[PDB]
Every structure is written in structure tokens, then in C-alpha cells.
């Protein structure tokens, strides 16, 4: 607070209460200026005084915070609402919004009509969006230099942990194209979480191998069971199998030790019975979903029982669909005399076991009922592979979004840097009250790539200087090729000429970034009447 305290609950009337609210709005934003981009910086938020969390994501930061003003309150919720939407635009949206709200209360107040003043802000975003739609000059992965091969290459060079864009470019191309499930949300799209990406420790540090068809992860090292019988047909049992507990459970209500005991003797026998019947059908490899205890591991090994274990359910789940097996379609027992089907078997070209790089894999070559691929990263450690995966995932997300909306832009603050000059040429042209409306809208766009620059320590001054030159009054064109630059790599923090990097983000996120920053000005304004309630 400041002003009189004649009334309370964020009422002080006149100039003072407006001034109080906008400063506070600005404090939130300043936190998120330093955390802006993929260059964003870690913050420490102390949550009591015996707890801490380390975060560097824009929406997350704001959630833990203690709002205590109406301006505070509307701005956190705007960020969180955007997090719900996509979760991209989250660092940026706040920063633009801080400037907008302050400028607009002044201009709406300086009315001829208040609906007209707000409409100018709308008019600036309508040109912006239109521009954004017209553009296919940067972030096009479908008419790239090498299509999806180039898009991935530049993405892996921007998020480099070694030598990448080499082996790793090819992976991105494979994984999107390995899903043949079209998800019609505006144009055909593929999930990038229906892919199987696997880690393998041992051998060459920065490598990849493409596998035709999905693969099941396991390891041999203390097993004596067969599971490496080369075949072509898999019986996929969603069904748990355990030699100790698959009928038994702890009862402490039955006095007699017999009931617990008897079922246990019988469950060593029936496991042996159960496997032969499944095999007879057509399989020589069985994939069994249930997990196993370290204590139980010795029994399966000793009895000699034919089972695939140390399985990963997610891997198994992909195989069953692709082979055309069903995991569940007739089972309902827990005896070893249990029925089994010839349709719960699936088909592959071969089900062959290779051990490559110190990891045993059963590899399903060329799956039938639909085709896939599984890319297994190769590091000299398991840890190396986590880094490589996370960077690749980013590459894969940007590619998928590109498929949905044909139209693309160099995303981040780069679309913004272009639009500043254009919405200014337009502001001037219109004149009157609307010239201010667009012009405050416009200058707010220039500031975000400059603030981002600071974070990677390339500075604001260096950024503006290089960039505005390329834009001109006869280079207002959207083109489809460079003659003026318009992108801006955001990791580099200075403009380059990589026009398909994964630090660009398409039209889908960037249109809603513009709308959410404006909305914050409309909304704080939306009130009619101010009262204190005792």
C-alpha cells in the first residue's frame, strides 16, 4: 500500500492505487526476465525456511508465490492458464503483459470511446497474426533444406552435449515417420511418445543405431532360463506370473498354517505346466508383463522356466499392438491348465535376440499389422544417454507442431522483433488515438529478445543493432528465403542464418502468446466500480 488508508483491501483511490498495482505487476515479470528462454537461469524460492525448490520455468515460479494484490493475482493465473494450454510461451507471456497493463490504463482513460481504445490493441495483434500466417521463411520442416533431416540437425547443434546433428539428426526423421497413427487435429500429426527410445550403456559415446520394428529391453547376467530362442512369434501375456505369489497373499485371520502353505507348493508346479501350453500354440518366446522380486529371481532360474523377464511394460505394450497380439482376450484363471489363444499370438518377420553394446535386446524386426522403428542411443554411460534424450525430445516436439500448422515463423521473441517495425509503420499511417494503441503494442515486442540476450550475456545493445538493419521498408516481405533475416537463435543470443533451429516455435504457440499478453490489460480494466467491504 501507499496513499491514504481511509479504506482498505487494495483501495486508496486516485493515482496512488494504480501506481501500487503496476509496480507489483512488474516485480513478477522481472523474476521471469532472467528465467526467459532455453538460456533461463535457476532461481531459489524458499517455501517456508526449511525448504527450497530450484526452478527455471516461468509458470512454476509464479505458482509458489504469495499474491496479495489484484494485479498480482490476474498475472499468475495468466501464466498458469498458458501452462495448461501448451506450456510453451510461459516465460514470455508475463514479460510483455507487465508493460501492456501500465500503458493501457493511461490510453483507455484518454478515451474517445473505451471500446475503441481496446480495439486498437486488437488491430495490432490482427496484423501480427496475419503476418505469422503468411510467413514460411524460417522454421519450415516440410519444405526444409533437407526437410525433417535439416530441422533435426540444427536442433541438436543448438542443444549440443558432444557431437550431435550427426547420427542424432537421422533419429528425429525416423521416430515421427515410425508412427503411422494419424491424429487429425488440423492436418495429420503423429505422437512422439508412441515411439520407443532406449538407453544402452557401453561402447561409443555419441552414436545411434536404427532398429526396424519396436524392441523389448532386458539383460542377462544371472539368468539360466532360456529366453533367447530365435523365432517369429510372441505371445503377449498381460497376466502377472510369479512362482511365489499369483494366488497367495498374506492372511493373519486364518489360524491354520495349511491354507497358505498348500497353495504355495502347487504354484511352483503350475508355472512349469502353464509355459508348455502357451509354447505349443506357436510361440517359442513369451513376453510376460509382471515384474519380479530379487528373492523370486532364483526360483525362475533354477526351475529352468522359459520366460522373458526384466521386461519394461511400455516396450511390451508397443510390441503387442504392432505384432497384432492381444494382451488380454480370453484369460481368467490362475491355474497352469489355463486356456490360451492363437490370436493372442502376434506376428513379426523374425523375433531374433542380438546383444549389442553390453545390453541384451530381443528385437522384433519388421512388425506386421503396422511398421515402426525404435532408436537405441549409444553412450559410454547410462547418464550420457539421459542428456541426449532430453535434447532430442525437444527436437521431436517442435517437428510435430510444425505438421499441424503449415504456416510457421521463427518463434520465441524473433517474430516479435520483426513485427515491432511493421506495427509501427501501420500505427503512424492510421493516426489519431489508434496510433498510440498500436505503437505501445509494438514497442513491447522489441523488448523481449533484448532481455533474453542479457541472460546469455550478449546484451541488449548488441542485439537490436545487428537485427533492425536486415528489416527495411521494402523488406517487409514474408518471402520463403533469406534476403533479409527475421529469425534469431535464442541460445546463441545473436542472429545467425540457421533457419530451422528447434529454438523456433511455430504459429500455434506464437498467436496465443500475443492474445494472452493483451488480455491482461483488458481484464484488469474490466472492473466497473471499486468498493471496500467491511
Q: 376: which strand partners?
A: 198, 209
Distances 76 to 26, 55, 66, 67, 452 between C-alpha atoms, Å = 12, 16, 10, 8, 20
Is 22 one of the binding residues for another protein (CB under 8 A)?
A: no
Least distance CB 399 / another protein (angstroms): 29
Contact 344, 236 (CB under 8 A): yes
* Catalytic pick among 60, 83, 90, 288: 90
Q: Nearest distance from residue 243's CB to another protein, in Å? A: 9
If DSSP codes are grouped into helix, strand and coil, which group holds residue 76? Answer: helix
User: Segment near another protein (CB under 8 A), from 34-42, 323-331, 416-424, 503-511?
Assistant: 34-42
CB atoms within 10 A of CB 390: 11
CA dihedral over 22, 26, 29, 33, signed as positive or negative: positive
Part of the chain binding another protein (CB under 8 A), chosen from 4-12, 182-190, 300-308, 346-354: 300-308
The whole-angstrom separation of Cα 534 and Cα 522 is 28
**Whose Cβ is closer to another protein: residue 300's or residue 441's?**
300
Catalytic residue among 183, 386, 394, 459: 394
Please count the CA atoms within 13 angstroms of the CA of 61 that sit on its side-chain side: 24
Backbone angles phi, psi at 360, to 5 degrees: -85, 140
88 assigned binding-site residue: yes
E strands within 190-238?
197-198, 207-212, 215-217, 231-237
Contact between 45 and another protein by CB under 8 A: the answer reads yes
Per CB under 8 A, the segment of 79-87, 136-144, 151-159, 453-461 that binds another protein is 453-461
Contact call for residue 34 and another protein (CB under 8 A): yes
- Residue count, binding to another protein (CB under 8 A): 54
Q: Is 5 exposed, middle or buried (0-12, 13-18, 19+ CB in 10 A)?
A: exposed
Closest CA to 486 of 15, 8, 375, 476: 476
Interatomic CA distance for residues 342 and 235, integer angstroms: 9
To 10 degrees, what angle do helices 90-109 and 70-85 make? 140
Q: For another protein, which is the closer residue by CB, 94 or 128?
A: 94
Candidate list 91, 154, 271, 367, residue with the active-site label: 91
Q: Which residues pair with 362 in a beta bridge?
A: 216, 353
Residue 388 in contact with residue 377, Cβ under 8 Å?
A: yes
User: 126 among the known binding-site residues?
Assistant: no
- The footprint of another protein on residues 206-265 (CB under 8 A) is 221-222, 224, 244, 248, 250-257, 260-261, 264-265
Active site residue 90: yes
CB closer to another protein, 303 vs 331: 303
Q: Is 528 annotated as a binding residue?
A: no
273 binding another protein? (CB under 8 A): no
34 is in an annotated binding site: no
CB of 464 to another protein, least distance (A): 13
Active site residue 57: yes
DSSP letter, residue 379 = B
Smallest distance from the beta carbon of 512 to another protein, in angstroms? 27
**What are the residues binding another protein (CB under 8 A)?**
27, 30-31, 34, 39, 41-47, 49-50, 52, 54, 56, 64-66, 68, 221-222, 224, 244, 248, 250-257, 260-261, 264-265, 268, 293-295, 297-299, 301-304, 455-457, 461-462
Residue set of the binding site: 37, 88-92, 158-159, 412, 505
Residue numbering of the annotated binding site for ADP: 37, 89-92, 158-159, 412, 505
State the catalytic residues.
57, 90-91, 394
Amino acid at each position: 500500500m501507499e496513499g491514504p488508508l481511509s479504506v482498505f483491501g487494495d483501495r486508496s483511490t486516485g493515482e496512488t492505487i494504480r501506481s501500487q498495482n503496476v509496480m507489483a505487476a512488474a516485480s513478477i515479470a522481472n523474476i521471469v526476465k532472467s528465467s526467459l528462454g532455453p538460456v533461463g537461469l535457476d532461481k531459489m524460492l524458499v517455501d517456508d525456511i526449511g525448504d527450497v525448490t530450484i526452478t527455471n520455468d516461468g509458470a512454476t515460479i509464479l505458482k509458489l508465490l504469495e499474491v496479495e494484490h489484484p494485479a498480482a493475482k490476474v498475472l499468475c493465473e495468466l501464466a498458469d492458464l498458458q501452462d495448461k494450454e501448451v506450456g510453451d510461451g510461459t516465460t514470455s507471456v508475463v514479460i510483455i503483459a507487465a508493460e501492456l497493463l501500465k500503458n493501457a490504463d493511461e490510453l483507455v482513460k484518454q478515451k474517445i470511446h473505451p471500446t475503441s481504445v481496446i480495439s486498437g490493441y486488437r488491430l495490432a495483434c490482427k496484423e501480427a497474426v496475419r503476418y505469422i500466417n503468411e510467413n514460411l521463411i524460417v522454421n519450415t520442416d516440410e519444405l526444409g533444406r533437407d526437410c525433417l533431416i535439416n530441422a533435426a540437425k540444427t536442433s541438436m547443434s543448438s542443444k549440443i552435449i558432444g557431437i550431435n546433428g550427426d547420427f542424432f539428426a537421422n533419429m528425429v526423421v525416423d521416430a515421427v515417420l515410425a508412427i503411422k497413427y494419424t491424429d487429425i487435429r488440423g492436418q495429420p500429426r503423429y505422437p512422439v511418445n508412441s515411439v520407443n527410445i532406449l538407453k544402452a550403456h557401453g561402447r561409443s559415446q555419441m552414436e545411434s543405431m536404427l532398429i526396424s520394428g519396436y524392441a523389448l529391453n532386458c539383460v542377462v547376467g544371472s539368468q539360466g532360463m532360456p529366453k533367447r530362442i530365435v523365432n517369429a512369434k510372441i505371445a503377449c501375456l498381460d497376466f502377472s506370473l510369479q512362482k511365489t505369489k499369483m494366488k497367495l497373499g498374506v492372511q493373519v485371520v486364518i489360524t491354520d498354517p495349511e491354507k497358505l502353505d498348500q497353495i504355495r507348493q502347487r504354484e511352483s508346479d503350475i508355472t512349469k505346466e502353464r509355459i508348455q501350453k502357451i509354447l505349443a500354440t506357436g510361440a517359442n518366446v513369451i513376453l510376460t508383463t509382471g515384474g519380479i522380486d530379487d528373492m523370486c529371481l532364483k526360483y525362475f532360474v533354477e526351475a529352468g522356466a522359459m520366460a522373458v523377464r526384466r521386461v519394461l511394460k511400455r516396450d511390451l505394450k508397443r510390441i503387442a499392438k504392432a505384432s497384432g497380439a492381444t494382451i488380454l482376450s480370453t484369460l481368467a484363471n490362475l491355474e497352469g491348465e489355463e486356456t490360451f489363444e492363437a490370436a493372442m499370438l502376434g506376428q513379426a518377420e523374425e523375433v531374433v535376440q542380438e546383444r549389442i553394446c553390453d545390453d541384451e535386446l530381443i528385437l522384433i524386426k519388421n512388425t506386421k499389422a503396422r511398421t515402426s522403428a525404435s532408436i537405441i542411443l549409444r553412450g559410454a554411460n547410462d547418464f550420457m544417454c539421459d542428456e541426449m534424450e532430453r535434447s532430442l525430445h525437444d527436437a521431436l516436439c517442435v517437428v510435430k507442431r510444425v505438421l499441424e500448422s503449415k504456416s510457421v515463423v521463427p518463434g520465441g521473441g524473433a517474430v516479435e522483433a520483426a513485427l515491432s517495425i511493421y506495427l509501427e509503420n501501420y500505427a503512424t499511417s492510421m493516426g489519431s488515438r489508434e496510433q498510440l494503441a498500436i505503437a505501445e503494442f509494438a514497442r513491447s515486442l522489441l523488448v523481449i529478445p533484448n532481455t533474453l540476450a542479457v541472460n546469455a550475456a550478449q546484451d541488449s545493445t548488441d542485439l537490436v543493432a545487428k537485427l533492425r538493419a536486415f528489416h527495411n521498408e521494402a523488406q517487409v516481405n514474408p518471402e520463403r528465403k533469406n534476403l533479409k533475416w527475421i529469425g534469431l537463435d535464442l541460445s546463441n543470443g545473436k542472429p545467425r542464418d540457421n533457419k530451422q533451429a528447434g529454438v523456433f516455435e511455430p504459429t500455434i504457440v506464437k498467436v496465443k502468446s500475443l492474445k494472452f499478453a493483451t488480455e491482461a490489460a483488458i481484464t484488469i480494466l474490466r472492473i466497473d466500480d471499486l468498493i471496500k467491504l467491511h
